Design an enzyme around this catalytic site. Structure first.
Site, short mmCIF file in Angstrom:
data_model
loop_
_atom_site.label_atom_id
_atom_site.label_comp_id
_atom_site.label_asym_id
_atom_site.label_seq_id
_atom_site.Cartn_x
_atom_site.Cartn_y
_atom_site.Cartn_z
N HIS A 88 0.86 -1.18 0.00
CA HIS A 88 0.00 0.00 0.00
C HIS A 88 0.89 1.23 0.00
O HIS A 88 1.89 1.27 0.72
CB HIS A 88 -0.91 0.08 1.24
CG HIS A 88 -1.67 -1.17 1.56
ND1 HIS A 88 -3.02 -1.17 1.82
CD2 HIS A 88 -1.26 -2.46 1.69
CE1 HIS A 88 -3.42 -2.41 2.08
NE2 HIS A 88 -2.37 -3.21 2.00
N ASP A 119 1.91 2.80 3.33
CA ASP A 119 2.69 1.94 4.20
C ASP A 119 4.16 1.87 3.79
O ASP A 119 4.97 1.38 4.58
CB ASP A 119 2.11 0.52 4.22
CG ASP A 119 0.68 0.47 4.77
OD1 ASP A 119 0.30 1.34 5.59
OD2 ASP A 119 -0.05 -0.46 4.38
N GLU A 123 -11.99 -5.89 -3.09
CA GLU A 123 -11.95 -6.80 -1.96
C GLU A 123 -13.17 -6.58 -1.09
O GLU A 123 -13.32 -5.50 -0.50
CB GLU A 123 -10.68 -6.60 -1.14
CG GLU A 123 -10.61 -7.51 0.07
CD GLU A 123 -9.34 -7.33 0.89
OE1 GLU A 123 -8.31 -7.90 0.50
OE2 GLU A 123 -9.38 -6.61 1.90
N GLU A 144 -10.79 -12.30 0.74
CA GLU A 144 -10.02 -12.55 1.94
C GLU A 144 -10.79 -13.49 2.85
O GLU A 144 -11.98 -13.27 3.10
CB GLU A 144 -9.70 -11.23 2.67
CG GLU A 144 -8.87 -11.42 3.93
CD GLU A 144 -8.53 -10.10 4.61
OE1 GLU A 144 -8.27 -9.10 3.90
OE2 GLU A 144 -8.53 -10.06 5.85
N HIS A 149 -12.75 -12.14 5.80
CA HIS A 149 -13.91 -11.32 5.47
C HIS A 149 -15.11 -12.19 5.09
O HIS A 149 -16.26 -11.77 5.27
CB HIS A 149 -13.56 -10.34 4.35
CG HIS A 149 -12.49 -9.37 4.73
ND1 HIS A 149 -12.11 -8.33 3.91
CD2 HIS A 149 -11.73 -9.27 5.85
CE1 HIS A 149 -11.14 -7.64 4.50
NE2 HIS A 149 -10.90 -8.18 5.68
N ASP A 197 -6.68 -13.27 -0.45
CA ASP A 197 -5.86 -12.98 0.72
C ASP A 197 -6.04 -14.17 1.67
O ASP A 197 -7.15 -14.44 2.13
CB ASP A 197 -6.27 -11.66 1.37
CG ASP A 197 -5.72 -10.45 0.64
OD1 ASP A 197 -4.91 -10.62 -0.29
OD2 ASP A 197 -6.09 -9.30 0.99
N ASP A 228 -12.20 -9.00 12.84
CA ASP A 228 -11.30 -9.37 11.76
C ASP A 228 -9.92 -9.59 12.38
O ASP A 228 -9.15 -8.65 12.55
CB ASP A 228 -11.36 -8.22 10.74
CG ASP A 228 -10.56 -8.45 9.49
OD1 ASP A 228 -10.54 -9.57 8.95
OD2 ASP A 228 -9.96 -7.47 9.04
N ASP A 233 -7.36 -11.57 11.25
CA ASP A 233 -6.30 -11.66 10.23
C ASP A 233 -5.13 -12.55 10.66
O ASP A 233 -3.96 -12.21 10.48
CB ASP A 233 -5.78 -10.27 9.85
CG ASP A 233 -6.82 -9.41 9.19
OD1 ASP A 233 -7.77 -9.96 8.61
OD2 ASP A 233 -6.71 -8.18 9.28
N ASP A 289 -2.06 -11.70 3.42
CA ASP A 289 -2.51 -10.51 4.14
C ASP A 289 -2.92 -10.93 5.55
O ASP A 289 -4.10 -11.06 5.89
CB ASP A 289 -3.65 -9.83 3.40
CG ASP A 289 -4.06 -8.54 4.06
OD1 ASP A 289 -3.31 -8.06 4.94
OD2 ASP A 289 -5.12 -7.99 3.71
CA LIG Z 1 -6.95 -7.85 2.43
CA LIG Z 2 -8.86 -8.32 7.19
#
Ligand SMILES: [Ca+2]
Ligand SMILES: [Ca+2]
Ligand SMILES: [Ca+2]
Ligand SMILES: [Ca+2]
Ligand SMILES: [Ca+2]
Ligand SMILES: [Ca+2]
Ligand SMILES: [Ca+2]
Ligand SMILES: [Ca+2]
Ligand SMILES: [Ca+2]
Ligand SMILES: [Ca+2]
Ligand SMILES: [Ca+2]
Ligand SMILES: [Ca+2]
Lengths: 413, 413, 412, 413
Positions: C73, C76, C204, C240, C243, C268, C279, C281, C312
């Protein structure tokens, strides 16, 4: 600091003034005590020490704007850490001294203080339930200092909350050692409070999860199981936070009633979650069902809220980022709980639910039901009774009927 | 008749025979004990009495097909009610005598029986927590009879489950009276089992909700709070059902570990829910993580499963409506838990997790940590230690590393 | 990363914590190596000095793990400046250093994106903001990212949920926000055409968090939006795993919905905790989810196609040592490599397909063929049913199929 | 028979009459239309044919007790199946004749009818999405008959609902074939309604799950994706059920707004779930926030509810089993939605939310924001604008302010 000169005043339910109370009339008498006494509303608390001194001034400005008598704080939110523990405590001492003088001048009172053992990275594994004994020692030093400050400022309660006491995974957890160590830590704090003559009510705040997968004081019943197991129940009541109730799969009034009938409804954090979001959003409380039914439980508690209060441990929405939104948000929550108090008190005075409950369970005040309750009846005599084959006729629970009454009182009181 | 002549037999992990065990080898020895003895698998149970007799024949046919040594039943699931309680008990006695016959000729044993106080409309408000004292008396008569039958058939355990004991709404609920009456009922049951010399382990099965909004034995901790409060903890252990763990917001292994360290892991019902569906689907257990981690907890319990067993309280899917699906479903679950036992036993023997846990918490076995655990350290000495300002270095919890090992062992053991 | 060497495959019996137990990049599976099946992607002092150091650490990690693809990104990889001009100057400077690292190390850009989430200006969203000034800044940021995507040879470009949703419907002009979301995405399509940016555009889905509702809720909801606004021909989905379950679906459900709508663009790879409403992750470890995800991907046209299996994911907060980044990718890479092995054998063996073939055989003959063909109508179907021939359904065999799944996960 | 006799009448908010409307005044005019016309309340619908005929009588008795003008029914709920499909349809025709005469004599209107393709075990795999073409044929015959009956009785809408159209597991599902067949079936139905001149608005009711793991019409946006993909959007609007919205993770007013801005808000089923229970409880609607905000979305719909209505597809609680509870339950839900309409209309009339929204998005009606909406602004030009680095100042979302207003109107309107 808040874009708001003057104080917020009660203007009645018809007022269109957005900076006035519509339902919170602090002087309104309800069942022989003022709304102010019923609710005991509490409000939550440049760089370094200059930012800290400014935070003090802003806290008491807001207390004066809202006409609120009680406040709460976490140590690490009122002063920055130093380069040593000694300097951390010197910074805290200096800010506590400023707060003490403001409390005297303004007549404001400390509902509770607490230790923030959540933010600093040393607590990544928790505090009392840490895997690192060095962190446990620091946590003890921090709570020691916070009990000193609670005594100095006249705190009416002292709160232990979930922070990072729980687990990310049971795969790497020694559960018995963590729970044993939590119980040791809490008893050490009890020992220390006794030794310095700190007579505040100790409170544990349940929280089921977030940021951790599981946090040990999961809900009221789970905390009470731990308190009973470790001989701590005589020292602690519960600080019940609405959003934490629903995060645990219970209504707020469920947690409050469980607490109440175990003598452990100590204080409340008034906020609300979003039941469609699995995380703790800590919105200011607006739901009139939740506030009505919470005050319904509180009004039946011995002494009402007692030494506790209705504390707004709540966060403005991320999109309500203007200073004035802090005043709007408290107005939202204070009016919601003042309306809840009005409606609950009238429901209690009219026995609107109690008369239906009295009739529902009337069979336990006569005949075989009375003998069950008194201990006279046993499996032999109950079987002989049932072997009479007298027809069993149950009575409706009238749930929809009572729900209509609740709606009617919310609107009409 | 299950469309299946003969017994299901172990045929190794390579077999493509759908009616053969791929992992459950009853005689394979694991840590000095056969799979059969580790798992103690249990299986859970034309009109009127002829349908009832046929169902007995079908149950013992299935026990023989699956080579299962244990079964469970509910009274009202094995015999129809009569026109009086007397006739209900005559019908039940007649079927109990036919069951006792099949136990003689087949050697199968009764893991537990129970009273179904859920189906009949008299229990609409509950049983012990009913609003109608006449229902309380009928419930006592029914449990009295079930304790007699448990004694007569040599039940190793006796189960109380939370069918209708809870509330639809707190608005019409006298909570204290219901919980007091639940404690009275359970103590009367304890009294009666002692009087008749029934030595089965009493078990309470937690369930948080469904069909009701809230059920009082919400999870292990909540039930233990109630048992401790009413001086019943010495008489009861828990029957833990996997779906009820997740329905309550916990993993199954969480509920098992909590029970274990309170000496209350009595038996299990092996099934699984769907965490995307909130309503107790009671599917046969297929998740190899859940079975591995459940058996990991059970193996560390004193005596393993003890007088309990791994009982398949599960239902075939609505779409698996052929007789043979019952056999397929049990093979699914029996293989899942046999694999879980193999994997868990090797994880324990290799100390795959215990070595990380030992190193994680090593600070509590020396220095200031040992003084914390022993009670020598207090807030004064812990503060003095922390005031040395020695750097605190925490160690990683290695969650992802341990998850790799879990995957490796599930696959490679 | 306190680990100098390269992680290599050592097989399922190895006790080396820094070795792959299942990911053998060279192993051939149905005529394609694990490396090209999976196309694993890895997802990316003060100021610019810290920025340059993070570039070096990124490619150091790509070399440690033997991973060929990466994502980033914009916000980032480089700090903002005191003007938009300076922000883009900082960004350009870091992009120049990433390009050289791509050439030397041979690594490829799976996708880049615009982070319109962190800076307070996006508090109300980006495309769906209430402040037109923010919409303009958002367009400028995506414009720049499309240029960098072209310059670095991005195979996809992602638009993600961020702040596009609502906190409360009470203050939301839903039609305006959705109209503006569509305006913004079309403008982006217009611009990619100009500069010859050929990467696959991807959306996404995310149902919620931090906001109460986010508009690209799941695959079907995003597809409804794309179809309504004539954008479906320009976008596929970046799915993802967390998600999906946050939206109430299994990951394989979202993947199959996307696949039969020609919109499975990339994934992802992570997992949530279905007992936690947020979330999380986590690096993917669940072999059921990874097996059934690779099952869906292998049936997509060209497999993952131009997308990849992009990690991710975040290390746990308690996994804070550098080496844990390596352990976590090993966990997720081995889980998805095992997923591929099991899924491919299930597909090869037609372990589910044969059951499905028999289950629905009635629709390939007689009245079922006339239903499918369009010949049968209510009149002729009623006449058929009025024959009262017995209806005999067949078991779905769900428990049987779950035993097969367990058997392959362990045995292949 | 409902223990009542006489009609429930409006008595105003202060009445203590449990059998009187407190808020539903059918004759009260609100924004130029009566409550009766705004709401268009609908009510939902011995052995064998004798029980079926008694049910007809009881239906219309309840419609007269509640002063409700609209009703709905499912075919298999009004008549028993026969030994052949011919006999089933003969039984159905006979009951339909009785209903037709009751409609004429009582002046009650059919809001919608539907086919129950859920109860009979032939639909175990679904109806249109079944794996068995023979079931698809039966399903076609059943809907054909229902469309005939809907035309005969003058249904204003016709509903297709979730039933078992979904999957238990994707492992055994041909997803494309099931969805293709669902679209084929719906088009066949459209074809047949055209052929017989049936002018009712076709409706699809979304449901995300229960009893199946996934049901294809998951929510409004998902159903709309399907209707658009298969060229059916021109034929169908949505029947939005409040409990199905929250089961899908949305608020009810979210589903209504999504439907409304896509031209697909056809009718509603007014109930409420329990957001702490993961299943479809279909309680009568009592939440004044949900009813207020639902009527808020409906009043802004083209024609309001249009040809749909506010239909009480709800069940009395299991514990409210007396006949009179059916009356109490409708009074609860009718008063909740009548109060919702009062509050929503005044919120709309006062532009209490709309003025805040107008100002919130004012930037898109001028300057660079107009060029964006007009299509004139593009990436080249928007970047030029942003590159001037003019200060970005966002304005608060005022959520807490708006919630205070919502609370004030609920109480004060
Ligand atoms: Ca993602
Ligand atoms: Ca996420
Ligand atoms: Ca821990
Ligand atoms: Ca909180
Ligand atoms: Ca709190
Ligand atoms: Ca009850
Ligand atoms: Ca169950
Ligand atoms: Ca059970
Ligand atoms: Ca928005
Ligand atoms: Ca299906
Ligand atoms: Ca429903
Ligand atoms: Ca419905």
């Amino acid at each position: 600091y808040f874009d708001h000169v003057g104080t917020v005043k009660f203007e009645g339910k018809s007022s269109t003034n957005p900076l006035a109370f519509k339902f919170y009339n602090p002087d309104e008498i309800i069942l022989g005590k003022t709304m102010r006494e019923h609710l005991r509303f509490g409000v939550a608390y440049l760089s370094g020490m200059e930012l800290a001194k400014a935070r003090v001034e802003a806290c008491f400005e807001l207390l004066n704007i809202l006409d609120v008598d009680y406040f709460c704080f976490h140590d690490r939110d009122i002063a920055p850490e130093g380069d040593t523990l000694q300097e951390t405590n010197r910074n805290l001492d200096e800010i506590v001294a400023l707060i003490k003088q403001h409390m005297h001048s303004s007549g404001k009172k400390l509902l509770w203080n607490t230790a923030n053992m959540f933010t600093n990275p040393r607590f990544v594994h928790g505090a009392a339930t840490t895997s690192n004994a060095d962190v446990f020692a620091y946590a003890a030093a921090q709570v020691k200092k916070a009990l000193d400050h609670g005594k100095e400022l006249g705190a009416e309660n002292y709160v232990f909350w979930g922070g990072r006491e729980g687990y990310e995974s049971l795969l790497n957890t020694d559960l018995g050692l963590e729970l044993d160590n939590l119980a040791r830590f809490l008893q050490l704090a009890v020992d220390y409070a006794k030794e310095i003559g700190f007579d505040a009510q100790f409170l544990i705040e349940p929280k089921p999860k977030e940021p951790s997968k599981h946090q040990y004081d999961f809900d009221a019943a789970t905390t009470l199981q731990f308190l009973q197991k470790y001989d701590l129940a005589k020292h602690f009541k519960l600080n019940l936070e609405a959003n934490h109730a629903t995060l645990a799969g219970h209504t707020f009034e469920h947690e409050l009633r469980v607490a109440r009938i175990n003598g452990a409804l100590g204080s409340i954090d008034a906020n609300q979650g979003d039941l469609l979001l699995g995380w703790d959003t800590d919105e200011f409380p607006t739901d009139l069902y939740a506030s009505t039914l919470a005050m319904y439980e509180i009004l039946q508690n011995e002494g009402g809220i007692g030494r506790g209060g209705v504390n707004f441990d709540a966060k403005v929405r991320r999109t309500s980022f203007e200073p004035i939104d802090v005043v709007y948000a408290h107005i939202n929550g204070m009016d919601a709980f003042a309306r809840g108090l009005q409606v609950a008190a009238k429901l209690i005075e009219d026995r609107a639910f109690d008369n239906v409950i009295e009739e529902r369970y009337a069979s336990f005040t006569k005949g075989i039901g009375a003998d069950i309750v008194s201990g006279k009846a046993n499996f032999h005599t109950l079987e002989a009774y049932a072997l009479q084959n007298n027809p069993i006729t149950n009575k409706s629970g009238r749930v929809e009927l009572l729900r209509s009454i609740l709606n009617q009182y919310i609107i009409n009181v």
